[PDB]
Amino acid sequence: GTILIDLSPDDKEFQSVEEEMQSTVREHRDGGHAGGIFNRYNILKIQKVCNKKLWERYTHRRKEVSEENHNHANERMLFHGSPFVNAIIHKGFDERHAYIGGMFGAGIYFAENSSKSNQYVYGIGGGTGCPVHKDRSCYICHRQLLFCRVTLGKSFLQFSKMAHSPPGHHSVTGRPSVNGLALAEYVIYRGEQAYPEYLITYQIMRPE
Numbered sequence: 494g495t496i497l498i499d500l501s502p503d504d505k506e507f508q509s510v511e512e513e514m515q516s517t518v519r520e521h522r523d524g525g526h527a528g529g530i531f532n533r534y535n536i537l538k539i540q541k542v543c544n545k546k547l548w549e550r551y552t553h554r555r556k557e558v559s560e561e562n563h564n565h566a567n568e569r570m571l572f573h574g575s576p577f578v579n580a581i582i583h584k585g586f587d588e589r590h591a592y593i594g595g596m597f598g599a600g601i602y603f604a605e606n607s608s609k610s611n612q613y614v615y616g617i618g619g620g621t622g623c624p625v626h627k628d629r630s631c632y633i634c635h636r637q638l639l640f641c642r643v644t645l646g647k648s649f650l651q652f653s654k655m656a657h658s659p660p661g662h663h664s665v666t667g668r669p670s671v672n673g674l675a676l677a678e679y680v681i682y683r684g685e686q687a688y689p690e691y692l693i694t695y696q697i698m699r700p701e
């Protein structure tokens with residue numbers, strides 16, 4: 494029961510998501526190893542993901558989380574990148590597919606920087622790159638990110654094995670560093686604690 498609502502470029506909702514996409518790009522200090530070399534995206538399409546069951550699941554959990562955290566959900570709009578985007582918009586996030594060796598264990602990973610989530614689109618460390626060219630900096634193939642509604646509740650701050658949130662907490666927040674560049678990473682351990690609200694189709698742009 495997922496319906497995709499194709500948003501017009503003149504729509505403020507489209508523009509808002511587009512600006513969040515572009516403004517949160519950072520210069521990773523890994524030469525573009527994982528996600529490619531770029532300053533900007535070519536934004537092709539933004540679709541609103543409408544699924545009534547997934548949404549009700551999300552808000553049911555958000556209530557429970559809110560009650561356990563002094564009537565605060567600590568809800569954020571965050572990026573997700575992975576190879577499972579098309580499954581996710583249909584069936585929701587699912588922590589049973591999470592990877593056990595993740596830095597913060599077996600959860601579902603989000604970012605406030607679009608360009609960090611772009612590093613996971615093709616797998617962890619960007620896997621083997623795009624399917625067609627095996628190129629992690631591919632400028633041709635179109636990528637997809639989710640801009641999602643995420644319930645963090647009481648988030649546990651963790652350094653850079655773990656299966657669930659620590660006792661009394663509903664999420665983990667990390668700030669891992671790659672070369673003096675530390676960026677935020679948010680991790681939930683329940684699929685219902687995020688709703689994949691917008692599907693963004695895009696390319697990374699070749700700089701001049």
Ligand SMILES: COc1ccc(C(=O)Nc2ccc(C(=O)N(c3ccncn3)c3ccccc3Cl)cc2)cc1
Nearest residue numbers: 574575577580581584585586587590592595601602613
């Ligand atoms: C068939 O139905 C399905 C519906 C939803 C999912 C789903 O939520 N997949 C998913 C769950 C967690 C992540 C996730 O955060 N990560 C995974 C996990 C496994 N493989 C690659 N990345 C992850 C782990 C560490 C760092 C970054 C990421 Cl994106 C990425 C994708 C999977 C299947």
Ligand SMILES: [Zn+2]
Nearest residue numbers: 623626631634
């Ligand atoms: Zn390619």
